[PDB]
Amino acid sequence: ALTPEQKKELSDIAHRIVAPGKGILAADESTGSIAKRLQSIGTENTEENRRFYRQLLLTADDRVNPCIGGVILFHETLYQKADDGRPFPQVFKSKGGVVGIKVDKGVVPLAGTNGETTTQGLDGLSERCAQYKKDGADFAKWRCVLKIGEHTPSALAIMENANVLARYASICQQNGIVPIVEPEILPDGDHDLKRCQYVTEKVLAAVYKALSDHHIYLEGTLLKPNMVTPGHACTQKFSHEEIAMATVTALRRTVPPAVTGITFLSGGQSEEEASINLNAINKCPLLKPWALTFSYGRALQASALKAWGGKKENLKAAQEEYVKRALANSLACQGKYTPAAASESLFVSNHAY
């Protein structure tokens, strides 16, 4: 499947990204779905605004060096230049970070099912990843989404999603790109915490069997899951020790140790819940043989975005907000996080990007 030279390259890359203290910034929103984040702060969705906004994030003045191993970028963002003319991958790489690339092509429905979806992307994938590798990306991301309704997530969806996740992983590692396997269970719903924990266990079990089946090399992988969390509409209330227990036991029962790190997705939690729960998790007493960090998008950019507010004059003001959150999360990601747009929940029904 893979030579040893090729396994060292992936294992290396994978550990780099989640070395101690570091997480991933998810700046990988599609054009259409970044556009509605910009509309949130009354900014027109334009190549330059998008470029400007991404540039603000990749140029954050260096206390974020120890906190941000990697950045997932959307396809166009990887071919965009800082204002000095320098391509964004080289701007971020020079500072010791690693560039990632969102390669899925969005979700697609599953006939005969109660709203579930595959996602698509695999076509032309390997040649795309060849390009993205030569243009500076050392890891990729692929988002699949399941939801919890009563007859959701069905076997059919879990089986097909874990499988496409495995196809993609296998194509990425062929091209020396560490795959990020994201089986996101959406928080959409009334479900309680344990319901979510069970669905997450069944999903990840299915994904890691799929990965085994497709002979993907787990030491050169990372996993971006949802934390385990009550449904949005869940009335019952659950602590962060309970969410971190639920989340950590879910992961100990499914994710074999060889997986090099677990970079959590925000899930639509507020920026601060995200860092508290991330921290709680790392402080969970149980034994956690993988890197438990963050790959947050919205939970590292809410404060930033509403600082920037479409206006060039706050660039520094927005990127100091960004930095604050990265530092918060680089401590949560060690257990060392002790602490109001950052508490605004960032929930989005059927989050798409």
For the annotated catalytic residues, the residue numbers are 182, 224
Alpha helices in 284-348 (DSSP H): 302-308, 315-332
**Residue 80 in contact with residue 144, Cβ under 8 Å?**
no
Residue in 82, 122, 234, 315 binding its own copies, rule: CB under 8 A: 122
| Cα dihedral 127, 224, 190, 159 sign | positive
Query: Closest Cα to residue 301, out of 79, 14, 34, 99?
Result: 34
CA distance 220 to 204: 17
Smallest distance, its own copies to C-beta of residue 307, A: 37
Residue in 21, 70, 97, 121 binding its own copies, rule: CB under 8 A: 121
| HEC sequence for 112-181 | CCCCCEEECCCCCHHHHHHHHHHCCEEEEEEEEEECCCCCCCCHHHHHHHHHHHHHHHHHHHHCCCEEEE
Smallest distance, its own copies to C-beta of residue 41, A: 32
Q: Residue 345 annotated as binding?
A: no
Smallest distance, its own copies to C-beta of residue 336, A: 21
Smallest distance, its own copies to C-beta of residue 154, A: 9
- The residue among 77 and 161 lying less far from its own copies, judged by its C-beta, is 161
Residue in 4, 150, 235, 340 binding its own copies, rule: CB under 8 A: 150
118 binds its own copies (CB under 8 A): yes
Could you give the string, one character per residue 209-228, with x where binding to its own copies holds by CB under 8 A and - elsewhere? x--xxxx--xx---------
Give the rounded distance of the alpha carbon of 28 from its chain centre.
9
Residue in 83, 111, 134, 237 binding its own copies, rule: CB under 8 A: 111
332 binds its own copies (CB under 8 A): no
Residue in 1, 19, 233, 317 binding its own copies, rule: CB under 8 A: 1
130 binds its own copies (CB under 8 A): no
Is omega for the bond preceding 153 within 30 degrees of 0, making it cis? Answer: yes
Q: What are the start-end ranges of the E strands in the chain?
A: 23-27, 68-73, 98-102, 107-109, 117-119, 137-146, 178-185, 222-223, 261-264, 291-296
Q: Residue 261 annotated as binding?
A: no
CA distance 132 to 342: 33
252 binds its own copies (CB under 8 A): yes
Residues lying near its own copies in the complex (CB under 8 A):
1-2, 105, 108, 110-113, 118, 120-124, 126, 150, 155-156, 159-160, 163, 167, 170-171, 173-174, 201-202, 205-206, 208-209, 212-215, 218-219, 249, 252-258, 287-289
Question: Which residues are annotated as part of the binding site?
Answer: 37, 266-268, 295, 298
